[PDB]
Design a binder for these strands. Structure first.
Ligand SMILES: CC[C@H]1OC(=O)[C@H](C)[C@@H](O[C@H]2C[C@@](C)(OC)[C@@H](O)[C@H](C)O2)[C@H](C)[C@@H](O[C@@H]2O[C@H](C)C[C@H](N(C)C)[C@H]2O)[C@](C)(O)C[C@@H](C)C(=O)[C@H](C)[C@@H](O)[C@]1(C)O
Lengths: 146, 23, 37, 214, 176
RNA sequence: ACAGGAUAACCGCUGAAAGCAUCUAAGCGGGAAACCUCUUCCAAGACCAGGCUUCUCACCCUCUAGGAGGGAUAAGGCCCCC
RNA sequence: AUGGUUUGGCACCUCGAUGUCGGCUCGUCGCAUCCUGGGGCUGGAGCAGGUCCCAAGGGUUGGGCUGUUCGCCCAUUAAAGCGGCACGCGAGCUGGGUUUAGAACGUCGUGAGACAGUUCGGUCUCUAUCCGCCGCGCGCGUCAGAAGCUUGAGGAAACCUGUC
RNA sequence: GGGGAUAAGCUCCGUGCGUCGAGAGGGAAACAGCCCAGAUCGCCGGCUAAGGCCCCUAAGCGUGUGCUAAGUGGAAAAGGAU
């Protein structure tokens, strides 16, 4: 029988990704891989094993092309004519962490488990984070050559 | 009009090979 | 400023340019001045 | 800044101007107010002052509430409210224990009075949202007052959240704007606010200097 | 290109300081700051002049070359000579008198209009119906001269309003 | 309402590609009841379920002593009553 | 060429039932804008226009005739917009029209009868289970139990305008 | 090929043409009639077809040379256009 994680088999570690000057799409897919625990060989779809991912410098993140002014982030309140949109440029100015969060949130499974994964993603606008007591391991986005 | 043109278009998909039932 | 799908240099002074991805025609005479849209 | 003081609505009456014109004023008791606590940016994240009002027997005040008053060094008061200012330059005008009176206002200064409206209970759509009705003759079967159509049919097929229908009304906070104050009675500590302020006779109101005309 | 392939002569009284892609020029009339684009490298010939170079021949380098060169020459000329824009006003009862650093226009409106001088620009009135605006930045001199030109709507029938001296405005005839 | 920000149509400045010219490709500006703030109200079930304070801030029993179960309490609340 | 609202073409869902025109009450959406807002060009002197571009926040009257939608007319108005939502809306209302049985006229038929001809009269049923929506509570959670006073992410309301 | 307006998811014909009807499984987001392939049963073994290999989502943010600035990709005509 294939091995399946037991009660206490799961383990966690903390990763901090410098979001400065990283492409939004590229950074998000890297974080969405970490949070789901895809890197571990102990992966199991119905058990979360992802590692807490801290994203710092979340307001410097680079978006290519004209997407800073022509990409809208829509939201509907349910009331008739309640569809209000904010272009990415505005969404970065008011509260910048949202742009990184949504682009990660839409990368994870949408089921109940994907709601549990979100609890393990902390993203901050500034270059500093309060989680220094947990000793995050700095993480960088490379690509295995084939 | 909008509905009709969209159905005839999605027959061009790579996996349909240019044909689809009910055109 | 005429707005037509077809814009042409009506007179010899008329010049055809492109601003922000939209074709215009600029002439000293304001009547000739038109824009593609 | 935005002067404010907690008051009690006493009633309406009528007084005459120097030009012999008649003005219908509302008498508001702006009783002495004690500043119990000040909210600063470094402490709380906003700049606001917390007033207290009304006389209450010290046996009635509950122990958690009593400690808050003793720590601030003032006697307990029935109502405690808070006015939100907009900068630290305005907070410095206030200190704990300082007492406010009706004198902070002057004759002719536009004020905004806030209070809880009167209670009207379960109100129909003819009363709540000011619908029309349907005719009382020419054959109307039992529909003299009910609203009528609610939506389309099968598209959308739902009722479209936000539609106006029957339900409880009144008894909700509301603010009146740019109410001139006709006279600042000094001895009795009473404002003569020209107009009809919201509330019920003997209900707590908050009178503050007007946003628009201030 | 052809514009970009012409060295920028710096007269003897002008100081030029280069820090990579950042350039600052100091002269008698004041101090200016500029930054050049990434593709173009800006260096100084030992003769005491300015030379700009483009590495390749695509749109970006070819287009940026002519701009970047002629941006410096405006920068150097501003701090040695400066720019003065001369204007003149046409119309009956149209007056200009200077108040401090601000300029006031009597254009026939029910009220008089006032223009404030931003930093680095100065207004010098010569006659009631003729004045001038002077400054360092060619863009800022031309910018304020634009705003002044927009004070009154164009008038093809009588020509009332503000003008440039050499400006020739078209005029039609109001007959019927 | 007043005021502010980014804008549409439109008007521009400085400007090469293209010795000239061009509001544009790099930059900089003006610009509407529309948009974001501004006014009123709801709002921490906002599951990231928030903040500043204050009060109580401690007593027994059982199985087996690991955790759980039971009872009596404080600050406080509810019920009954006007 | 767009749009799919008009007159049609097809007969694919429903004939062990999808209630059909006008009016009322209630809305909501689009902009191809009637007023208000910003502009270009004018064979734009001024007042007033004409045409085109941007703009959907608010507003868009009361009556005479007809079952009328539509239309003509009387008074105003800044304006009296065009359309979608089963030609919105009858388990919300009317039944004037149309389309049952009575009756008459004109016309067709030898006759029973008939007329997208006209005229008078002619039952509008139902205790809301589920989603929906307007309101109000009970339980638990927010890592001890409680009480004050709040920031507010996110929503909702409003936005009209004339004369002097 | 006829009828139609060389319209219809229209209608009538031909076809050792197919499939559905009477057919599961993979692909086309979902989607009888399109593409791959005809299910005797079991297996926690392997190779492939159409289709894919940034995350959802399995396997490439694959290698070389170029092209695009329009989110073209990820709807369209006469015609306009340094
Ligand atoms: C009083 C009590 C009656 O109420 C009425 O008079 C209502 C008002 C009729 O509407 C009368 C009145 C009226 C105007 O319709 C409202 C007229 O159109 C016809 C004659 O029906 C009804 C409901 C008819 O339905 C209608 O039948 C139509 C053929 C189809 C229609 N719809 C589904 C397609 C449907 O509603 C129908 C067949 O008589 C129902 C059957 C079962 C009955 O006989 C029942 C037992 C009746 O005794 C009754 C309901 O109690």
């Amino acid at each position: 029988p294939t091995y399946t994680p037991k009660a206490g088999d799961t383990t966690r570690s903390w990763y901090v990704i410098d979001a400065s000057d990283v492409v939004l799409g590229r950074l998000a897919s890297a974080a969405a891989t970490l949070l789901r625990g895809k890197h571990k060989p102990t992966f199991t779809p119905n058990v979360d094993g992802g590692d807490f991912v801290i994203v710092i410098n979340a307001d410097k993140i680079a978006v290519s092309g004209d997407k800073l002014t022509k990409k809208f982030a829509y939201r509907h309140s349910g009331y008739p004519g309640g569809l209000r949109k904010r272009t990415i440029g505005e969404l970065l100015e008011k509260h910048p962490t949202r742009v990184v969060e949504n682009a990660i949130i839409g990368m994870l499974p949408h089921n109940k488990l994907g709601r549990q994964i979100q609890k393990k993603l902390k993203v901050y606008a500034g270059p500093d984070h309060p989680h220094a007591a947990q000793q995050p391991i700095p993480f960088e986005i490379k690509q295995v050559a084939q | 009009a909008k509905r009709g043109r969209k159905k005839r278009d999605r027959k061009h998909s790579k996996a349909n090979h240019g044909k689809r039932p009910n055109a | 400023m005429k707005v037509n799908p077809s814009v042409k240099p009506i007179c010899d002074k008329c010049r055809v340019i492109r601003r922000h991805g939209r074709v215009m025609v600029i002439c000293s005479d304001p009547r000739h001045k038109q824009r593609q849209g | 800044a935005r002067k404010g003081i907690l008051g009690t609505k006493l009633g309406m009456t009528q007084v005459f101007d120097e030009n012999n014109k008649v003005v219908p004023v509302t008498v508001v008791k702006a009783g002495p107010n004690v500043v119990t606590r000040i909210r600063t940016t470094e402490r709380d994240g906003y700049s606001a002052v917390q007033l207290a009002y009304g006389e209450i027997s010290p046996r009635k005040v509950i122990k958690p509430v009593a400690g808050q008053f003793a720590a601030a060094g003032v006697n307990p008061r029935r109502h405690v409210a808070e006015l939100r200012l907009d900068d630290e330059a305005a907070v410095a005008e206030y200190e704990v224990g300082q007492e406010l009176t009706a004198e902070i206002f002057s004759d002719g200064a536009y004020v905004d009075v806030t209070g809880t409206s009167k209670g009207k209970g379960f109100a129909g759509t003819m009363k709540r949202h000011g619908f029309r009705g349907q005719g009382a003759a020419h054959g109307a079967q039992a529909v003299h007052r009910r609203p009528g159509s609610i939506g389309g049919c099968a598209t959308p097929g739902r009722v479209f959240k936000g539609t106006r229908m029957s339900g409880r009304m009144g008894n909700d906070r509301v603010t009146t704007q740019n109410l001139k104050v006709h006279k600042v009675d000094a001895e009795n500590g009473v404002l003569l606010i020209k107009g009809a302020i919201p509330g019920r006779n003997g209900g707590l109101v908050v009178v503050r200097s007007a946003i628009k005309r201030g | 290109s052809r514009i970009g392939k012409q060295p920028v002569p710096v007269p003897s009284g002008v100081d030029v300081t280069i820090n990579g892609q950042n350039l600052s020029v100091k002269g008698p009339k004041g101090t200016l700051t500029l930054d050049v684009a990434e593709p173009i490298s800006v260096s100084r010939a030992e003769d005491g002049a300015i030379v700009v170079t483009r590495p390749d021949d695509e749109r970006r380098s070819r287009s940026l070359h002519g701009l970047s060169r002629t941006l410096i020459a405006n920068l150097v000329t501003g701090v040695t000579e400066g720019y003065t824009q001369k204007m003149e006003i046409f119309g009956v009862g149209y007056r200009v008198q200077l108040k401090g650093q601000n300029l006031e226009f009597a254009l026939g409106y029910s009220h008089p209009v006032l223009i404030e001088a931003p930093e680095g620009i100065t207004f010098a009135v010569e006659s009631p119906t003729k004045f001038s605006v002077s400054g360092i930045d060619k863009q800022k001199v031309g910018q304020i001269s634009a705003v002044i030109r927009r004070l009154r709507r164009p008038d093809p029938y009588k020509g009332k309003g503000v003008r440039y001296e050499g400006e020739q405005i078209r005029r039609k005839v109001g007959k019927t």
